Design a protein around this ligand. Structure first.
Ligand SMILES: CCCCCCCCCCCCC/C=C/[C@H](O)[C@H](N)CO
Ligand SMILES: CCCCCCCCCCCCC/C=C/[C@H](O)[C@H](N)CO
Ligand SMILES: CCCCCCCCCCCCCC(=O)O
Ligand SMILES: CCCCCCCCCCCCCC(=O)O
Ligand SMILES: CCCCCCCCCCCCCC(=O)O
Lengths: 251, 57, 274, 238, 238, 274, 57, 57
């Protein structure tokens, strides 16, 4: 069916033209068991105050646009009380729910690829050098891809067909993905569990997964139609818990 | 100690013997005959089970 | 049997409302359409299997990971032994096979292939006994030997293997020796909590070093030797498969690249010839 | 002691043997396995995933995003082909760099049936019908829709469901085909032709875009591992 | 005789194998074992013993007895720290030479929770209260008692019982930490601050001395033996 | 299983008179305080073990104990063979590991690693057969060979092993051969009852000697060889653990030292940086 | 003679075989799987058993 | 595992033992003692069975 509703915390999300819900690699986000845990102290578990939908900034799908990416959970640094527990606790563990919505018309056309890339290590633009943190993820805005080659000395290689990683951009469909076809679809929701090699990790020096939105089939329309087609991203943490409470840093 | 297992032959004296000599589990031979698979996690990672003959939308 | 492939069940003509070909990729779903839905097929008993395509049969093949040379000369004591910070990034054929997966957990066999020669110049040997090599593994933080004939070559706790030339290659087994629960091939993050330092997997690689030397002075001439290390991962579990790499590697500590074309060119879009 | 006799093949190093070896660090305590999601048990779980096919790889389109897109257009139509390529999933400019063809280059032999899924990424008011044909390699490649209707073909009506799976059967005389193919183990051609054509209302974009996907069925198999001819090096990477 | 085949790894000398060997002197009669008291079955029975921690190791105090003593004083107080050091039990100037840190340098990995016991060696008429804090490594080290009260802290009232065990928990994302640590497996800091301060009667010494102890709990573990970087030589000792 | 570590039982808040943190070190007692007494913890199932930290896994690793050289020349018959009064004090890496315990009782495997070379000068060999070495153990009081080609190299009762160059290293097993009931690493006392003589462990070391030689004349040139002895103590029981040593060793028969600092210096007492 | 014992594996065909070939007890392999311990002799060497929750003095 | 089979001796302790050590059927020794035959396919490839004593035509 095409109508869904996802209620988390004090916030709901209603859609009327939905494809389905892709759920990670099969499993649902849950809490850390006693069989796998290694932190000795008691973990905190804020149910409603942390696990709720946060709406990020809006971008503009232009006719010459090529792609964007957000790195998580760094994109929700100043989003409510989820970002306040990250500063006070040394450890964190959470799953997510990534709702991406872009409605245009019956007369517009286009396509998007919404992947969630775990451990998306990204390559620099000047080889024999290294990126900096200010070039990987902005504070709330989207870092975009470039159609041509990136010339910078400390930026990500933001070419689009190599996906910023050195791999084929068509082969990104292994990861949990949907497609926003403006002919059939309106929104794309992806539920990602906690994917890491360690049971918990500090969510300041480790981007857990990267959300990429890439238009494979570009946007065209007619001059009678609208000329502003925005994309909005709404991400909710799910089953979040923390350890290691100390002073806030930073700040 | 004699773990008699079957050899590899193609479907149209097929048994072999294997002893573990050393005291560590990393010392063993390779587990070349574990042929499980579950491709539904990447092919069908959905919340609702999708039928082929029924329409998707 | 295990683990065979599915058979094609026989099919006749049809006129149905249940069309299986028409689907929707927008849900992020790969279709389960077998050939019996779009054409008439016959009952064949497919006896093929996927034993050669499992994870354990794909990775349990030894590959070279380093090539190290060392002398037996006098002077320049850095050339009298070789060093290796342990990596799986220096040789590309094993680096690309590992980097199809994000995480990996396995045991390993490590085979050392040492092959020597006689160095040229005046005052050659003309009668030499066999050579013997000591291949010491130093876990992270141990005493590093500054040269050959050092106190750190005693190795009361470091595992060392002594090997005379002419016999079979040296080989031992190593368990899953990581700190975490999987060898992270990719690490999207930093080393310091202030988002500064070393971006990438090079901060997670803390496995130790490998040192190899001649335990014999000789006293007449020089003989170089070439240690080649071989890695065979066994008892392998793997998680989160990645796309295979497209651009060629540049560095042994980075995923840095230069942007390459997606495929090789062809003449036309409809180029069924020739 | 016991009298033995060393057979040929002693003191050799075969890279793909299954032998026991003494552990370097004995009685080592390994960290416990945690349930990481996404476990790969077989490489055919990766090749069974659809991935976008660069069928438009005519330079200059391989250094852009236009390699993955198929142009379709308006008037009049149907004396033109949509696309066309040989069926060679391991050795082709089209789809050896896809997810199916990357794992195929690690092996020498392949078998089974290949799926091709086609998404229509035009507007929601655009109609159309196409013919998606596959031809066995016995004869010459087709040049029009009268020669292409005789092979295995489906007819795709674009509507509320915007995808159609053309499932290429496994028709050969051998149980396996080579990955690096030749004139002996050739598989044929895959063509696409206009059935009726695009009819758009006034105020709609006249031209659209089709995307191509490729994956394996549940009877696909590979055999005879080898190294890929895809990546190279000259010296050790520092 | 029997046909064998020599695998790779033959005629080598691995220093940590478990093989049988023929005895040089056979049928040797060994002296009987007498019950000597103090049998060591495991090395963790030595690391579980408290030993005095040189936290005052600022030169010049390492060539004297003053390295083991902590100065506390009188007026007024509490805008001053008592001591402070990183949590690095294998690689630190503070407590790598203690009983816990000497056995840790024989291994590469370590895990578990570490105890710190503090004896107050002042006079029996002196009062006082202290704050013994431990901080996870996520943020900057604390500079006062307002930033140090948020971490794991106990409050020690000096009285008839003159010791308090601050038990550092095992909080990390990995099951093991390296002994030779780095920026990745850092564990944090251990600080101490005045809660109220020393109040002594007239005729009592105004300044006192705190001693620090360190040992392991019952869930401590080590792994991956290596040689210590603590002792060296150049030639054979005659 | 065996031998795992204790789990942390879960804990809530409390307000008790039973304070477990406040204790008294004056009784000479190390406290049994687990983290559940001073903070709220959670139930984790700790699956770690202490198998790698036992006595047998700590000491059953071979370490070098001597390095001895000998010739095959003519003239100076003391250089034609090597001697060793058997010690565990000459190489430091095994000396420090033994000296964490006062007493020790074990069996042993002894591996000999011999590595030769060709000595320089005129009239070289240019065609030599393989070398063979005899490694005789003399229990205390036996006939000492004055040189090579002696009557004492018959060894009708002394255990000797003959080893050609090119094969695996020689290895035999030795029981607990002490006079007492434990190898005393430390001996606070004298040798004579009048409190005179040899203070220390050097009077208790009566284990015999080890002699190694070439059994072949050669007749053309000189080839030096280097015997390296390796000790692996197995079936180990140990008593009365000692503090590990701080100052570096000087002598092979003494605990004499020079007074070293207790640790390395740091800038301040409150030096949490950087 | 076949003393079938268990290998070393980590808790989330594990048996090996061992023969004693020589006539001496010092000829055997190492006793690497004896994991007893008693740390009470050095941690609590008291005449009276001390309780944690009860005060010492 | 002990597949005790008979040796080769001429008709006027004749048994041997064989273990399969490796996990593949192509690793085995040769099948030197399979002595079947059927020469009627080339000697008598007829549709009708021909008798010797009866005339052919
Ligand atoms: C002289 C005795 C040598 C003993 C040989 C042991 C040394 C090798 C130990 C390290 C090998 C473990 C496998 C390492 C794999 C890579 O580090 C991971 N893919 C990266 O995390
Ligand atoms: C040519 C055949 C050689 C046979 C080798 C046997 C010689 C070695 C016998 C003595 C070794 C016994 C172990 C000695 C240990 C130390 O002496 C004690 N730690 C000190 O009391
Ligand atoms: C150290 C390994 C020596 C070889 C193993 C002993 C010889 C084979 C014994 C076969 C029966 C073992 C008991 C079962 O398993
Ligand atoms: C000198 C040792 C030869 C090898 C031992 C004989 C072969 C294995 C026999 C296994 C059964 C032995 C009886 C029990 O134990
Ligand atoms: C890897 C092969 C080791 C040798 C085989 C084990 C020793 C002989 C065991 C004889 C009984 C095996 C059980 C039957 O068959």
């Amino acid at each position: 069916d095409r109508v869904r509703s996802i209620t988390l915390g004090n916030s709901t999300i209603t859609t009327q033209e939905c494809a389905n819900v892709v759920v990670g690699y099969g499993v649902w986000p849950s809490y850390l068991q006693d069989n796998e845990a290694t932190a000795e102290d008691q973990p905190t578990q804020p149910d409603v105050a942390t696990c709720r939908f946060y709406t990020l900034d809006s971008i503009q799908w232009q006719k010459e646009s090529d792609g964007w990416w957000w790195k998580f959970p760094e994109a929700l640094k100043n989003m409510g009380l989820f970002g306040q527990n990250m500063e006070y606790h040394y450890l964190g563990r959470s799953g997510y729910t990534i709702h991406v919505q872009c409605n245009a018309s019956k007369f517009h056309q286009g396509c998007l690829l919404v992947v969630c890339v775990p451990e998306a290590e990204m390559g620099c633009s000047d080889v024999e050098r290294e990126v900096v943190a200010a070039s990987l993820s902005s504070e709330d805005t989207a870092k975009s891809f470039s159609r041509t080659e990136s010339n910078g000395q400390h930026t990500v290689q933001t070419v689009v067909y190599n996906a910023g990683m050195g791999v084929g951009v068509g082969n990104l469909t292994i990861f949990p993905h949907q497609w926003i076809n403006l002919r059939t679809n309106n929104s794309a929701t992806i539920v990602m569990p906690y994917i890491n090699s360690v049971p918990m990790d500090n969510m300041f020096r480790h981007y857990n997964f990267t959300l990429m939105i890439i238009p494979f089939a570009k946007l065209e329309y007619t001059e009678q139609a609208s000329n502003y087609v925005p994309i909005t991203v709404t991400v909710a943490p799910m089953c979040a818990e923390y350890n290691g409470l100390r002073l806030a840093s930073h700040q | 100690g004699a773990q008699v297992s079957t050899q590899k032959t193609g479907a149209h004296t097929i048994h072999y013997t294997n002893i573990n000599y050393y005291k560590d589990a990393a010392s063993n031979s390779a587990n070349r005959q574990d042929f499980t698979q579950d491709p539904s996690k990447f092919t069908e990672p959905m919340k609702d089970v999708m039928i082929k003959s029924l329409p998707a939308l | 049997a295990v683990a065979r492939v599915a058979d094609t069940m026989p099919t006749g003509p049809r006129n149905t409302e249940s069309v299986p070909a028409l689907t929707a990729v927008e849900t992020g779903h790969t279709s389960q359409v077998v050939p019996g839905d779009t054409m008439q097929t016959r009952h064949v008993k497919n006896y093929h299997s996927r034993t050669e395509s499992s994870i354990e049969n794909f990775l349990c093949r030894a590959a070279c990971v380093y090539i190290a040379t060392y002398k037996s000369a006098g002077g320049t004591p850095t050339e009298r032994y070789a060093s290796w910070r342990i990596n799986t990034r220096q040789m590309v054929q094993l680096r690309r096979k590992f980097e199809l997966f994000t995480y990996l957990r396995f045991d390993m066999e490590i085979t050392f292939v040492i092959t020597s020669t006689q160095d040229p110049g005046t005052q050659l040997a003309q009668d030499m006994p066999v050579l013997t090599h000591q291949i010491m593994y130093i876990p992270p933080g141990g005493p590093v030997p500054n040269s050959a004939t050092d106190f750190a070559w005693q190795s009361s706790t470091n595992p060392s293997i002594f090997w005379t030339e002419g016999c079979a290659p040296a080989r031992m087994s190593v368990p899953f020796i990581s700190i975490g629960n999987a060898y992270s091939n990719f690490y999207d993050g930093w080393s310091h909590f202030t988002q500064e330092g070393v971006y990438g997997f090079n901060s997670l690689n803390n496995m130790g070093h490998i040192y190899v030397r001649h335990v014999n002075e000789q006293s007449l001439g020089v003989s170089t030797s070439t240690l080649r290390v071989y890695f065979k991962p066994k008892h392998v579990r793997a998680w989160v498969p990645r796309p295979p790499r497209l651009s060629p590697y540049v560095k042994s500590s980075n995923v840095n690249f230069k942007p390459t074309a997606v495929t090789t060119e062809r003449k036309d879009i409809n180029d069924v010839g020739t | 002691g016991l009298p033995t006799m060393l057979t040929p093949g002693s003191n050799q190093f075969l890279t793909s043997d299954d032998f026991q070896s003494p552990s370097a660090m004995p009685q080592f305590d390994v960290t416990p396995e945690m349930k990481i999601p996404g476990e790969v048990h077989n490489l055919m779980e990766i090749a069974e995933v659809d991935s976008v096919v660069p069928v438009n790889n005519t330079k200059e389109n391989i250094n852009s995003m236009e390699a993955y897109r198929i142009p379709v257009t308006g008037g009049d139509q149907l004396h033109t082909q949509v696309f066309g390529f040989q069926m060679q999933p391991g050795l082709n400019s089209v789809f050896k760099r896809t997810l199916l063809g990357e794992i195929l280059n690690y092996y020498a032999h392949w078998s089974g049936s290949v799926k091709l899924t086609f998404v229509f990424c035009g507007s929601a008011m655009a109609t159309g019908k196409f013919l998606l044909a596959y031809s066995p390699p016995g004869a010459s490649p087709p040049q029009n829709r009268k020669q292409a209707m005789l092979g295995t073909h489906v007819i795709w009506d674009v509507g509320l469901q915007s995808s159609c799976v053309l499932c290429i059967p496994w028709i050969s005389q051998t149980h396996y085909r080579l990955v690096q193919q030749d004139e002996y183990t050739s598989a044929g051609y895959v063509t696409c032709w206009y059935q009726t054509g695009l009819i758009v209302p006034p105020g709609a974009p006249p031209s659209c875009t089709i995307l191509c996907f490729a994956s394996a069925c549940n009877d696909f198999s590979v055999r005879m591992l080898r190294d890929t001819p895809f990546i190279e090096q000259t010296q050790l990477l520092q």
